[PDB]
Structures are given as structure tokens and as C-alpha cells.
Amino acid sequence: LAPSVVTGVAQSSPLTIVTNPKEPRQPVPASDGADYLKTIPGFAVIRNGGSNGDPVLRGMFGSRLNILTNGGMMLGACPNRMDAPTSYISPETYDKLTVIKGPQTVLWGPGASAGTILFEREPERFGELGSRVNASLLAGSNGRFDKVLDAAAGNRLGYLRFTGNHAQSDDYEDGAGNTVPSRWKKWNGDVAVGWTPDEDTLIELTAGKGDGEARYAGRGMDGSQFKRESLGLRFVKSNVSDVLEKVEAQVYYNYADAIMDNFRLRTPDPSSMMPMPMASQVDRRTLGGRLAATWRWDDFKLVTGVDAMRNEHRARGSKYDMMTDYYTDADQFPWSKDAVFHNYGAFGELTWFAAERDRLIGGLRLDRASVKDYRQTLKSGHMGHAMANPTANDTRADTLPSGFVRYEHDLADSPTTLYAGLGHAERFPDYWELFSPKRGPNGSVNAFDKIKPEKTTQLDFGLQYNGDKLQAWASGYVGVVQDFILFSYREMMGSSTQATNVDARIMGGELGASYQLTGNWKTDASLAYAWGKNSSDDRALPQIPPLEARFGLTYEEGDWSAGSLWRVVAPQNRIARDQGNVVGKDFDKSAGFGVFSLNGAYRVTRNVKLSAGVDNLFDKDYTEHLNKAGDAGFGFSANETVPEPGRTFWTKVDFSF
Ligand SMILES: [Cu+2]
Fold this sequence. Notes:
Residues 25-116 form the TonB-dependent receptor plug domain. One of its GO terms (molecular function) is metal ion binding. The protein has helices at 35-38, 431-434, 447-450; strands spanning 16-19, 43-46, 54-57, 65-69, 72-73, 96-101, 115-120, 133-140, 144-155, 158-169, 184-195, 201-214, 222-223, 227-238, 244-258, 260-261, 280-296, 300-317, 336-352, 358-373, 377-379, 386-388, 395-399, 402-410, 416-427, 454-466, 470-490, 496-516, 521-534, 539-540, 548-557, 560-569, 579-580, 593-603, 608-615, 648-656. It is an all-beta fold. The strands form five sheets. The protein has a 22-stranded antiparallel β-barrel. Strands 1-6-7-4-5 form a five-stranded mixed β-sheet, with no helix packed on it. Strands 2-3 form a two-stranded antiparallel ribbon. Strand 19 (336-352) and strand 20 form a beta hairpin. Residues 78, 80, 82, 221, 260 line the site of copper (II) ion.
């Protein structure tokens, strides 16, 4: 019951991880959902700068992970992804983080070929009048301050709750003492009044605001705003009937409003392109909903339901007077909408509790996806001159069925669990894969017209051991991807992208173990590996993270613990130069490295606990393979992968009344 700083999370269920995001973590994470995922084998991150990095599971990027917030989808607005759905997540304000790896549920949304990611606040629960409160201040290296506060009130009949937070940091320094252009600033706020007449009933109303900024070393333009709004409603009922157990119906509305410029967080680099002040305001509106009933009756259980979603994108950008010098910011011009996405689907997950020692799970879902191209001109003539968009007001759709079957079995003698499982998944294309690139497949009108859905057929096997003193888990995967969406780069003349559809093989795994040595000594270990190949070009896939290992040693006695952790990462030699995705590209083979860190935590009293840690003790100078290239407007020669941070100190008090 001693405290602890989190250095890793073992696999709880098969293919499932469940962590508490309110616990302190060793490589101390930004106010950002991608960072609270680094602590789970299988997860790399594209560094942009301070925060707001693009998550990556088993080498797969972007929408292939289905990243949810209270069951609802929080989508970004920028066409280059400086606001991935993680950028609007501050995980501290959430109670639970589940991750389902591989395409092994149909319950939570469409076309999660790579994996599923859940951020949940669990409903408040009282009994008599009451009031909880938790708070955490956090301070460390480089002007880093994080406040966070969660607070309830209510009784048997209802409740009210306010989570919020505020975080920020200044430009950090790398291992060679450079100042990396990468501050940030963030705040969130969320009310949640909930009504609970019988103990078999619940409604919940959720309003939220949020905003933030982020300097980006990797790009020629900074986030000076990622405003958010969010309203939503959740309805659930317990035991309608001897068979019908739950009825879950809910709605969400998530609006993302994101200004992005080159003058409010930096001076415009006159040297090359964009020597002009330029803003670009963009927004993204999301409405969607979900309805599911559950039926436990026999050695059997079944979740069937439908859901649907619609989202809308609009953009508008400054113009500069090249000759009189009268900048006119982008808000004085009309919101110019450009894309609309629709989805409707119906799903089912049937579970068979054969024996104690055998389970069977099989899920199916059918989806109907649609998108309309609302852009009338396209900025892509000569010097980007206005051209007639040959897909103006067009609209395509598709009905895309996914499914899976998983077989878990518990060995007779020892606490071991084996599991194999097959799954097939189809994903309609992204905003950024349809609209962002400047060229579609090789002989086409644009990308919207020709890019094809992505079909992934993946095999997921693995095992679990829950010993008295030894815990160990293994998850592996081998699978193939049809019409994998892929980006290609080439040198007003910046760099131009071509999205194509290629055929690709993939395979990898993760594995981990922890051993309880003495009652005070604990050692833990975790390994993570990914492999991917472009089958239709006899070449490796781009942007795959190289082999990675982490070794943990901790000591604890009743009231406190301390620990140290070892991260060693192999070099990536399989690259795909000038091929990547909408945020980034493979260019150069990466260098292995290792980085050591130290943590400790100390429980003062029932209500207050204390931890602190040191990050990258020996101040290693290193950069990670996935990280972007640096602007060269901050001093970045050629394709300089944006460096990691150096040695770093942080401390954090966790209050809990
Ligand atoms: Cu942007």
C-alpha cells in the first residue's frame, strides 16, 4: 500500500490494459493523452515539441486507433494534425484508461484496425450527502507548473462534479544544452450534474470548455489556440428484465476551434518560404451518439446496438498585403466549410462462457460511411493558384463490415491464460487522407475521388501468467493490410504529398513481466516490437518505431518507495525515405540509445502523498525515430529530428479529501 511512480502498465485482461491516469508517471507526461500512453508497451509518439504528439500503436498511425473520451469522439481541426484527438485530452481529469489492442471490439466505433483507447470518468456514487475532492500541484524543470482539481457533491438521489486543470511549461533543453522551441499552456473545465432516482437509473449532463497553445519545433507555424466546447448526455438503466440488464444510450457534441500562425509565438523566418505573417483558423464540429442493450441469460451475454456520427470541417486563413503591409487576420473573413463526414453502424458482441476455463467471443458490425467534398476552388494551380475543384459537392459512401473472434483458454494446473483471435476491419478514409494531400493516386483527379477504404485482417495471439510472485503477459500479432493509405513527399514551392493505396504486411508483439523478490524489492520488465512491409513496393513501411525495452527496479517499505528505470531503444534501420504520413516522413535511419531515470514517492498522511522524480539522469542527448524534422527557422540543419528533453526534475503533491 506504499505509494509508487508509474513506469509501465502490464496487460490486465487479454489484449487489454487498464490504468489510473491520476497516478504519477516517471517520464513525466505533458497535459496530453499521448504521453499517458507511452507507459504502455506498444505505444510510440511523434514529438511535435512540448506536448500534443501524435500517438502510434504497433506502428499504426492516426485514425487506426479509435481514441474516445467518455464514449465520444473528440476530433481535431488542423489539416496537418497539430491537434490530434489527444491534444484536447488531459488524462488527469479521467478516472480510467482502457486500451483494447488490435481490431478486437466492434462496440466503440468504426474501423479501429489498430486498437481502441478509452478515457472514462466513472459516474459519481454517493449514499447520504457527501463530497470528495482531489487535487494535484506539480512543478519541475523548465517552468513546468500543473494544477488539477476534481470535486464532487451529492447524495443517493443526484450529484454535481467539477473537474478542471491547468498546465504549462517553457521551452525545454535537450541533452546538448540546446533550447528546443516548445512551450505550451493548457486548461480544461468540465461540469457533470447527474440524476439517479432509483438505484437502477442514471442521466448525466456534461458540459466542458478547454483551450491551449503549443509552440511546434517541427513545423513552420505554431498553435496559438485549440479552443474546445463540449456538451453531452448519458442514459443508462439497470435490469429492465430478467434477461435485459443494461440499456446504454448517450449523445455527445464536441467542437474544436484552432487558430495557428507564425507571428504570435515566433517571429516569421524571412529566410525561406512564409516570410509573411500568416494565420489560419480552422474548426471542426462533431455530433454523434450510441445506443446499446446487454443480454445476459445463459452461459451467455450479448451487447447489440447501433451508433452514428456526423462531423463538419471549416477553414479560413489570413491574407497579407505584399506591398502596403496591412495584415488582415483570418477572423474578418467567412468560415469556408470544406468537408462533411457521416457514419451509421450497428454492432454486436456475443460472449460464450463455455467452461470456467474456456471463453469465446465473436463480434460483428456493419457501418455506412459517407463524405461530401464541399470545396469549390482548390489552392493548387501554378504557385498554388486557384483551380476549379473537379470534385466540388461530390459525395461517396460505402458499407464496411468488421468483425472478430477470440478464443481464451485457461491452462489447468497453473494460473496461465492462452488466447488466439482473428479480426477483420475496414476503415473509411480520414479528413486528412482525403482532403489534406496535394495529389491523389497516380492517375486521378484528386485524392478524395480515388483513395480506397483500408481493410486490415490481423491475427492476435498471446498469453498471461498470474503467479504468486511472478506476473507475465505476452501479446503478439501478424496481419495484412489492404489498400493501406500512405503518403509520399517531394520537393509557392514547399513540399507536396501524394496519398496512395498500397498492400502491406505487419507483425510484432509486446511482452512483460514483474517479479516480487522480497517484500520490499520489486523488479519489472517490458519489451515492445513492431514490423511492417510495403508488399506492393518490396520495401519496408515508413514510420515504424524501433525495438524498445524498459527495465524497472523498485524498493518500498510501508510508507514510501523509490525506484529506477532503464529505457534502451534499438536503432531503426528499416525506413522508407520520403514516405510517411500527413504529419511526418521517414528520412534517415535512427540511432539506438538508452535513458535512465529515478523516482520515489512518500505517503505523508491519509489525505496527502508526495512523489518526485528525475528524468534522464545522465542528461542523454537523443532523438526518437518518429519525431518530426525541425523547422530550420529555429536553427535546424537539414532533416534534424526534433530532439528529446535532457535531464529534468519534477515534484507533485496529491491531495485527497
Ligand atoms: Cu496547424
